[PDB]
Amino acid sequence: ARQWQPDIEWAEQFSGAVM
Amino acid sequence: KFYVREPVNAKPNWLAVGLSVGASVFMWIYLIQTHNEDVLEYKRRNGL
Amino acid sequence: LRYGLLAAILGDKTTKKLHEYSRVITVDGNICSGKNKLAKEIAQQLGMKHYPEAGIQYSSTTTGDGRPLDIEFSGSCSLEKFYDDPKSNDGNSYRLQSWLYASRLLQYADALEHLLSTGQGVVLERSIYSDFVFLEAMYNQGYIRKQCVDHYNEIKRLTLPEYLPPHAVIYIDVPVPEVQSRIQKKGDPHEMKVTSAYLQDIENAYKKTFLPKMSEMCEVLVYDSWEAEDPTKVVEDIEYLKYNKGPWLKQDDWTFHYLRMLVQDKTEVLNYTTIPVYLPEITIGAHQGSRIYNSFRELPGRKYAPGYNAEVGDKWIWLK
Amino acid sequence: MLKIILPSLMLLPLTWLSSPKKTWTNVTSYSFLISLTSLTLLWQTDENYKNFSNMFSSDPLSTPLIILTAWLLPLMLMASQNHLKKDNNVLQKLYISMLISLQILLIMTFSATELIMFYILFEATLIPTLIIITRWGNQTERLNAGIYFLFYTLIGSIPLLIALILIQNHVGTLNLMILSFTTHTLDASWSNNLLWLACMMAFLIKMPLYGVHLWLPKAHVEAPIAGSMILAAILLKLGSYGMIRISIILDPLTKYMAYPFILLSLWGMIMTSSICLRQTDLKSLIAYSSVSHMALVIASIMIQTPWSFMGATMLMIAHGLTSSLLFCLANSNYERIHSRTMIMARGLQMVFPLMATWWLMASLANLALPPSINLMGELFITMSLFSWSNFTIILMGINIIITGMYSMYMIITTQRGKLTNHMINLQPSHTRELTLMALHMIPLILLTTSPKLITGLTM
Amino acid sequence: IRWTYARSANIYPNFRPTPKNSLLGAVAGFGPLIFWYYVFKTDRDRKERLIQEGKLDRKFNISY
Amino acid sequence: QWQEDPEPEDENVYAKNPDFHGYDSDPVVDVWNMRAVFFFGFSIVLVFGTTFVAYVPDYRMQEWARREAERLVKYREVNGLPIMESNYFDPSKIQLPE
Amino acid sequence: LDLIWLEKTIPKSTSTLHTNMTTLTTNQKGLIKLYFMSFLINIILIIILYSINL
Amino acid sequence: MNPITLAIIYFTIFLGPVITMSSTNLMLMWVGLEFSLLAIIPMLINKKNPRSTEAATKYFVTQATASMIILLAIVLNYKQLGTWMFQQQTNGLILNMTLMALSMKLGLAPFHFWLPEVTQGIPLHMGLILLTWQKIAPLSILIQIYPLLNSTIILMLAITSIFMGAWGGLNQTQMRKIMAYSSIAHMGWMLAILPYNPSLTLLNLMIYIILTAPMFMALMLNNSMTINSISLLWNKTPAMLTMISLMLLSLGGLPPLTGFLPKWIIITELMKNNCLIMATLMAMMALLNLFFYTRLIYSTSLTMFPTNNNSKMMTHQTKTKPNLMFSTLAIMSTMTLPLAPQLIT
Ligand SMILES: CCCCCCCCCCCCO[C@@H]1O[C@H](CO)[C@@H](O[C@H]2O[C@H](CO)[C@@H](O)[C@H](O)[C@H]2O)[C@H](O)[C@H]1O
Ligand SMILES: CCCCCCCCCCCCO[C@@H]1O[C@H](CO)[C@@H](O[C@H]2O[C@H](CO)[C@@H](O)[C@H](O)[C@H]2O)[C@H](O)[C@H]1O
Ligand SMILES: CCCCCCCCCCCCO[C@@H]1O[C@H](CO)[C@@H](O[C@H]2O[C@H](CO)[C@@H](O)[C@H](O)[C@H]2O)[C@H](O)[C@H]1O
Ligand SMILES: CCCCCCCCCCCCO[C@@H]1O[C@H](CO)[C@@H](O[C@H]2O[C@H](CO)[C@@H](O)[C@H](O)[C@H]2O)[C@H](O)[C@H]1O
Ligand SMILES: CCCCCCCCCCCCO[C@@H]1O[C@H](CO)[C@@H](O[C@H]2O[C@H](CO)[C@@H](O)[C@H](O)[C@H]2O)[C@H](O)[C@H]1O
Ligand SMILES: CCCCCCCCCCCCO[C@@H]1O[C@H](CO)[C@@H](O[C@H]2O[C@H](CO)[C@@H](O)[C@H](O)[C@H]2O)[C@H](O)[C@H]1O
Ligand SMILES: Nc1nc2c(ncn2[C@@H]2O[C@H](COP(=O)(O)OP(=O)(O)OP(=O)(O)O)[C@@H](O)[C@H]2O)c(=O)[nH]1
Ligand SMILES: [Mg+2]
């Protein structure tokens, strides 16, 4: 295995107007 | 040369270096003189 | 003394430097329409600096040692792979286009900073104002997605308005049947696979969007090929333009000052091309991204800021 | 202590100024030589504790813990060396720095002479530890484990800060000797009941007490190896060390305020032990094993008898070495198949006969085989808990039976049966992996020959 | 992988409180804890009662 | 999809170096790292650390207190005194509430 | 117990409560008209509070 | 703007607080509050777009209304006592109206709804000025009358500000709002301890300023307004992650960082006065700050968010920022707890 590092889906949760 | 665009820090800023070192020497010499003038003043005011 | 407010207040002002040939000229046209030759003789005749068309490696050759970098450090895109497979699902096409806009945007700032700091004029082959013609061609042929076009228009909207436009635009009109022939007699095996329907779309964007858009702010010169084949004829057409429109009329010392602070700060120039909008075409995972970043920093002269690299013979580090 | 602390502060410049090919050798060589110097603390020929200054001082409770911390640093460096081989140089030196920083704070935490100084150091350990679990953890869940670890501690620790300030605003000082020799009996008013919980919940969360323990199985299951080693061996014992230190000033409210927590520990330990029977993840099975051992430590401290303290101190040191040995062993498989499932790899004794011996000895320490100090703790905690009340033997009898099952079930499942022959990547055990186990087990055997060194304050 | 994930990371998302769960957790949670409280409290009250009236034989007991 | 490295493969640590000890990929750095752990770990700490702990004398007065208890159990038996008094502090010095 | 009810009661309900509050008090319409209208309520409450303490 | 305008406008911005701070008379203190209000306005609205114009408008009508209320207090007091300074004999209601107006000027909740929005519509460097230098003038007035302030009003405002600042900041993906709510929460701490020990309000202000200054400077390095923008720092200025993380933990009050000292000493001094309940809630809601500061640390230094292709050009280029002040303020704002006894007194 390899260390999990954030993907596109993970980062899109900080992309909105609010959290 | 190596860089196509010559670096801003191509050579030392001798003005800053001498000024940078100058202040440091001055502050240590002033600091040390001040300390002795305080230990003498401290002793003299207190009978030691 | 790096340019700044104190440099301007002590005398470094642009309006003194400008003369009649302190102009930005952009030579436009289709593929193999003679821009290279014409742009090189406009600059030589008028005493202007020539900027060859910004390519994949434009920013490799303006920094460091000026030598091309491995393609992973320089955009991870291939013009040759665009012509071999324009619809590959590895996102090459829009990666190539997005990278080309950024490099053009940087060359424009390099060109403008030269203009405003010395007064010498510049000639550029294409620019950030004509760059979109290639993008529109890709989308019409299905080579990129609609989301890629949105991401391009977003970056353009955040970077293009910051800058002054060219004084003059020198379009060279070459019909596709002649263009398609020139590409064939050029030689490059990959560039010969270009579809003529793609070339036409480059020509339609030019005449239906670029030229009407620029005539509202720039002196536009359209030359058929035979008119352009004698560059001296074109330069005599440039010596007598009046330049009576566009933003350059309303510029003073302190409008130039703040434009010069923008274009000398290359991270400020490129800032908005890197916005965190997650198109799979251009997004890079941390693993690949960190591998590349670390390999790049082990390159000769790239490990530390320019002037502090002992490998490439820098001196007096302990005093800089 | 400044001769144990200052040389340890020098492993940080030594980490950064060493060559890329010398960092791991140099630091791990000098870590051993620092754990040798900490043995000077053991030179206690009298009944007076060692007071080195107004800041630091060592007791028979803080000396075993201090030494266990210093000895664990070289162990964790060797544990972290093979899963960091693919990182660039600055990441390794940044990992080594976070481990050293955790050893420096931990030593200062056990040697501090004042409660406020204990609290700050006791809170500073969250930073290097949060960085370790999150930056170097493996799964996506490491982000939720850092939050659970950070805010269980902090929520418990804010009331403790309040209570410590009230103690000083009333007594004038937080020095542990002065508070010992001037302690006044507390009234049984409803305000002191809350002062008691304020002073205790911080440490009862870190143990952890049953109920508020869900941070531990989350933290362990996702920390890198050296994250689990320090967590299971020292950071849990911050709770125990704190409760012993501060419970002197809380009398007589511990005679009744402790009932809810003796009951959560005694019942809670059965709940956690029985979990280890049905736990599908090997690293998770050990983490619940820790929760059920600390239950006895909580229960024995709450009754404040010379035997109960003596058993808890022995069990603190014994659990420190044993749980760490188990995590290292589970890691050794994990660094081969990159799976934590306990049933995935089986029959490993066929190809790792020596590593299967360490498994057996770790497992026998966990189920407290006489004469190991694991039993001495369990046995002296039982003796005291029996005198406290005679029906606690019912619950400790059960927990002892369950503790045998999940210890051997752990060994039978992974080391016996047929080999899972598709695992062609079962490389022979490294010399490094075997040294790591010998370093855990030899001290544990030596401490059994000289139990006097870990009897604590009462004995 | 599916089995181990179904039995850990996927339990809570698929848990909905109901009357039978809530009663079961309430009884499972505090049921045993209340039971033992009265066993120990009752025992130690009988022990503290018998030390005030001296009716205990702590004859050779000197460790606790 | 997005640009991303493929997952690195399953390497055999013994393939190239059959005497790999577990510490380093470079054989020479690798053996000296094993040697250091064994020397400072086993020859120095465990041996001398164990010795230094075996010769700490009179540890916590476990030895003095026995030597002293024998002195007291003798002195008190010959002089007819009780082996150990019920009260610790002399009742003379304790002024009780009236 | 551990996987469900001990999560639900402590860590999960604490995160639910505070997410609930940060949602109520952060969804403001951005209208200065409404802000001053609340600033008006605040002022009256201070007047009332001080009034009943004379 | 040309150098004459900057010299005039930046001098006036500096002049205001110095007039308020050096003035014995209340009308001259009010005058300094006007200088700051007037001269900041052109700075805020310099970029001239729909958002900075709304920001400069919301700011003007808020701060002008608060100014008129302060002036009413200064004038009702001159009617009552024939003097231009607040006395022990000043009417109680005169003091409370001054407090509410000044808190409206500081941004203390519940008079806070303007601050996060104004900070959002303006450039980063003017957010730095607005969230730092602009707080000294209203605070210097308050510290001059701390024997008179009603503590019940002050503690309700501080408790509100610590709660609203925590809850507000928990929901924000815009960095400039995270800084405004950070400010609101810290002003709660400065204000809670004001009527008891005004020296601790100056310690908490100074430590907040030297933490908030480099944090803005860090965001001004790449002009990063979002959590996703700041997540690219590992591929843009990775040298910055070590000190961004500590400053964020330091802003969070975590030991053993300098930012623990202000909360710890305020709590200590609050309980010297028997302010147990308020102190406990304050410390318990300061925990919520650390959560959304931790979430930021997760996105930047403890993980690597996906990066984009065009960021490779960014690396070929050379930056001339940050300056020598960022490093000086970063170290002092994090590694100065061992000097705590020299900071409190
Ligand atoms: C969820 C978090 C829980 C918070 C826990 C905090 C710890 C609890 C502390 C005990 C409760 C407060 O303890 C309080 O101490 C103060 C002084 O310190 C005393 O209280 C009293 O103090 C003095 C007299 O001493 C009086 O003038 C005053 O009016 C009154 O407050 C009482 O002793 C008790 O009311
Ligand atoms: C007696 C004193 C003890 C008090 C202890 C209180 C500790 C408080 C811990 C705060 C926990 C915050 O918990 C926060 O929200 C939930 C908790 O399920 C986690 O979130 C997780 O579960 C939720 C379900 O609700 C999912 O939406 C999410 O995808 C998943 O990651 C967050 O990743 C964590 O950040
Ligand atoms: C007095 C203070 C004591 C409490 C201390 C504060 C601890 C923090 C608790 C509040 C914050 C946790 O808040 C928790 O955030 C998680 C983050 O996943 C939210 O969960 C969210 O996860 C992801 C990303 O955020 C979203 O895609 C999802 O839809 C949503 O559920 C939870 O709905 C909320 O419960
Ligand atoms: C920044 C603080 C430090 C500086 C301290 C203040 C002293 C500054 C001295 C340098 C002054 C230069 O400021 C000078 O301003 C004038 C207006 O006044 C500008 O001049 C402006 O007005 C003139 C009027 O004839 C026109 O040409 C035109 O509208 C415009 O250029 C100059 O372009 C600038 O050179
Ligand atoms: C006694 C008198 C006291 C005088 C006090 C002076 C305080 C120092 C003021 C420093 C002001 C300079 O700080 C400010 O820098 C920022 C960059 O961060 C510039 O701001 C810039 O923002 C972005 C990108 O950064 C650009 O698109 C914009 O056009 C430009 O304004 C401002 O043009 C400059 O004004
Ligand atoms: C109380 C104990 C002390 C606590 C000290 C806090 C230490 C800082 C913790 C936050 C983490 C620092 O953040 C860390 O930054 C370094 C370089 O700065 C990054 O380092 C890595 O990435 C960057 C580029 O991406 C490279 O320059 C570097 O060589 C590489 O190893 C790590 O990926 C990141 O995790
Ligand atoms: N997709 C894409 N291709 C581009 C872009 N700019 C240049 N190219 C390609 O890169 C090559 C650049 O050469 P050109 O300058 O356009 O044509 P030429 O052969 O050099 O002829 P002249 O320059 O006019 O003298 C062409 O083959 C173009 O297809 C672009 O913005 N997008
Ligand atoms: Mg070309």
mmCIF file of N, CA and C and ligand atoms in Angstrom, chain C residues 290 293-294, chain D residues 88 90-91 94 98 101 105 124 127-128 131 135-136, chain H residues 234-235 238-242 245-246 256 301-302 304, ligand 6:
data_model
loop_
_atom_site.group_PDB
_atom_site.id
_atom_site.type_symbol
_atom_site.label_atom_id
_atom_site.label_comp_id
_atom_site.label_asym_id
_atom_site.label_seq_id
_atom_site.Cartn_x
_atom_site.Cartn_y
_atom_site.Cartn_z
ATOM 1 N N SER C 290 4.464 15.757 -5.589
ATOM 2 C CA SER C 290 5.608 15.869 -4.698
ATOM 3 C C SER C 290 6.851 15.223 -5.290
ATOM 4 N N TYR C 293 8.145 17.854 -7.734
ATOM 5 C CA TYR C 293 8.671 19.022 -7.049
ATOM 6 C C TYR C 293 10.029 18.732 -6.430
ATOM 7 N N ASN C 294 10.189 17.554 -5.828
ATOM 8 C CA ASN C 294 11.453 17.218 -5.184
ATOM 9 C C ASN C 294 12.552 16.975 -6.207
ATOM 10 N N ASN D 88 12.262 11.603 1.510
ATOM 11 C CA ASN D 88 13.460 12.390 1.311
ATOM 12 C C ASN D 88 14.076 12.725 2.663
ATOM 13 N N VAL D 90 14.824 15.451 4.472
ATOM 14 C CA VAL D 90 14.278 16.379 5.452
ATOM 15 C C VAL D 90 13.072 15.781 6.157
ATOM 16 N N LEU D 91 12.352 14.870 5.505
ATOM 17 C CA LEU D 91 11.225 14.232 6.174
ATOM 18 C C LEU D 91 11.695 13.267 7.251
ATOM 19 N N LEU D 94 12.836 15.303 10.011
ATOM 20 C CA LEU D 94 11.678 15.906 10.656
ATOM 21 C C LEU D 94 10.894 14.887 11.458
ATOM 22 N N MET D 98 10.526 14.990 15.698
ATOM 23 C CA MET D 98 9.274 14.883 16.440
ATOM 24 C C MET D 98 9.333 13.785 17.490
ATOM 25 N N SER D 101 11.573 15.270 20.357
ATOM 26 C CA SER D 101 10.811 16.270 21.091
ATOM 27 C C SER D 101 9.840 15.614 22.052
ATOM 28 N N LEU D 105 10.048 16.236 26.276
ATOM 29 C CA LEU D 105 8.886 16.664 27.042
ATOM 30 C C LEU D 105 8.469 15.610 28.054
ATOM 31 N N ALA D 124 1.829 19.828 25.976
ATOM 32 C CA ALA D 124 2.715 20.015 24.841
ATOM 33 C C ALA D 124 2.909 18.742 24.038
ATOM 34 N N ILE D 127 1.328 18.073 20.410
ATOM 35 C CA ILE D 127 1.797 18.631 19.145
ATOM 36 C C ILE D 127 2.622 17.587 18.405
ATOM 37 N N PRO D 128 3.779 17.154 18.906
ATOM 38 C CA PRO D 128 4.534 16.145 18.155
ATOM 39 C C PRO D 128 3.727 14.899 17.885
ATOM 40 N N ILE D 131 1.166 15.545 15.062
ATOM 41 C CA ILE D 131 1.906 15.583 13.807
ATOM 42 C C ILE D 131 2.255 14.174 13.351
ATOM 43 N N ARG D 135 0.535 13.277 9.953
ATOM 44 C CA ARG D 135 1.421 13.427 8.807
ATOM 45 C C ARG D 135 1.885 12.076 8.282
ATOM 46 N N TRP D 136 2.192 11.137 9.170
ATOM 47 C CA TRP D 136 2.826 9.893 8.773
ATOM 48 C C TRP D 136 1.928 8.675 8.908
ATOM 49 N N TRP H 234 2.210 23.659 -0.075
ATOM 50 C CA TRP H 234 3.271 22.660 -0.116
ATOM 51 C C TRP H 234 3.959 22.641 -1.466
ATOM 52 N N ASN H 235 3.248 22.996 -2.522
ATOM 53 C CA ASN H 235 3.811 23.052 -3.859
ATOM 54 C C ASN H 235 4.173 24.465 -4.293
ATOM 55 N N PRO H 238 6.690 25.735 0.340
ATOM 56 C CA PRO H 238 6.734 24.729 1.404
ATOM 57 C C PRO H 238 7.561 25.148 2.595
ATOM 58 N N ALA H 239 8.506 26.066 2.423
ATOM 59 C CA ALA H 239 9.277 26.539 3.561
ATOM 60 C C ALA H 239 8.403 27.243 4.584
ATOM 61 N N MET H 240 7.186 27.615 4.206
ATOM 62 C CA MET H 240 6.288 28.361 5.071
ATOM 63 C C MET H 240 5.451 27.475 5.983
ATOM 64 N N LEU H 241 5.372 26.173 5.712
ATOM 65 C CA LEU H 241 4.460 25.313 6.461
ATOM 66 C C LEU H 241 4.875 25.171 7.918
ATOM 67 N N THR H 242 6.175 25.156 8.199
ATOM 68 C CA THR H 242 6.611 24.967 9.577
ATOM 69 C C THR H 242 6.092 26.076 10.484
ATOM 70 N N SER H 245 1.921 26.481 10.685
ATOM 71 C CA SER H 245 1.303 25.531 11.601
ATOM 72 C C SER H 245 1.444 25.988 13.045
ATOM 73 N N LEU H 246 2.654 26.374 13.448
ATOM 74 C CA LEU H 246 2.856 26.821 14.821
ATOM 75 C C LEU H 246 2.041 28.066 15.126
ATOM 76 N N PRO H 256 3.046 24.530 24.259
ATOM 77 C CA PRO H 256 3.728 25.530 25.072
ATOM 78 C C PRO H 256 4.052 26.766 24.256
ATOM 79 N N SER H 301 -0.263 21.649 6.143
ATOM 80 C CA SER H 301 1.047 21.109 6.481
ATOM 81 C C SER H 301 1.038 19.617 6.767
ATOM 82 N N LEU H 302 -0.069 19.067 7.248
ATOM 83 C CA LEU H 302 -0.128 17.662 7.618
ATOM 84 C C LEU H 302 -0.712 16.779 6.530
ATOM 85 N N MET H 304 -1.194 16.700 1.841
ATOM 86 C CA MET H 304 -0.887 17.330 0.559
ATOM 87 C C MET H 304 -2.124 17.229 -0.325
HETATM 88 C C1 LIG I 6 6.475 20.885 20.217
HETATM 89 C C2 LIG I 6 7.227 20.106 19.186
HETATM 90 C C3 LIG I 6 7.616 20.942 18.010
HETATM 91 C C4 LIG I 6 6.551 20.967 16.946
HETATM 92 C C5 LIG I 6 7.178 21.516 15.700
HETATM 93 C C6 LIG I 6 6.245 21.669 14.548
HETATM 94 C C7 LIG I 6 6.935 21.204 13.301
HETATM 95 C C8 LIG I 6 6.119 21.545 12.105
HETATM 96 C C9 LIG I 6 4.930 20.661 11.979
HETATM 97 C C10 LIG I 6 4.115 21.006 10.759
HETATM 98 C C11 LIG I 6 4.669 20.280 9.585
HETATM 99 C C12 LIG I 6 5.713 20.991 8.797
HETATM 100 O O1 LIG I 6 5.361 20.734 7.456
HETATM 101 C C13 LIG I 6 6.259 20.010 6.732
HETATM 102 O O2 LIG I 6 6.985 20.921 5.953
HETATM 103 C C14 LIG I 6 7.997 20.247 5.286
HETATM 104 C C15 LIG I 6 9.001 21.243 4.812
HETATM 105 O O3 LIG I 6 8.776 22.376 5.536
HETATM 106 C C16 LIG I 6 7.443 19.363 4.160
HETATM 107 O O4 LIG I 6 8.544 18.673 3.606
HETATM 108 C C17 LIG I 6 8.385 17.974 2.411
HETATM 109 O O5 LIG I 6 7.726 18.736 1.458
HETATM 110 C C18 LIG I 6 8.410 19.873 0.952
HETATM 111 C C19 LIG I 6 7.717 20.280 -0.347
HETATM 112 O O6 LIG I 6 6.433 19.825 -0.345
HETATM 113 C C20 LIG I 6 9.937 19.742 0.690
HETATM 114 O O7 LIG I 6 10.502 20.983 0.744
HETATM 115 C C21 LIG I 6 10.579 18.843 1.758
HETATM 116 O O8 LIG I 6 11.904 18.573 1.517
HETATM 117 C C22 LIG I 6 9.749 17.580 1.867
HETATM 118 O O9 LIG I 6 10.320 16.690 2.728
HETATM 119 C C23 LIG I 6 6.516 18.356 4.828
HETATM 120 O O10 LIG I 6 5.841 17.672 3.878
HETATM 121 C C24 LIG I 6 5.527 19.058 5.787
HETATM 122 O O11 LIG I 6 4.914 18.116 6.544
#
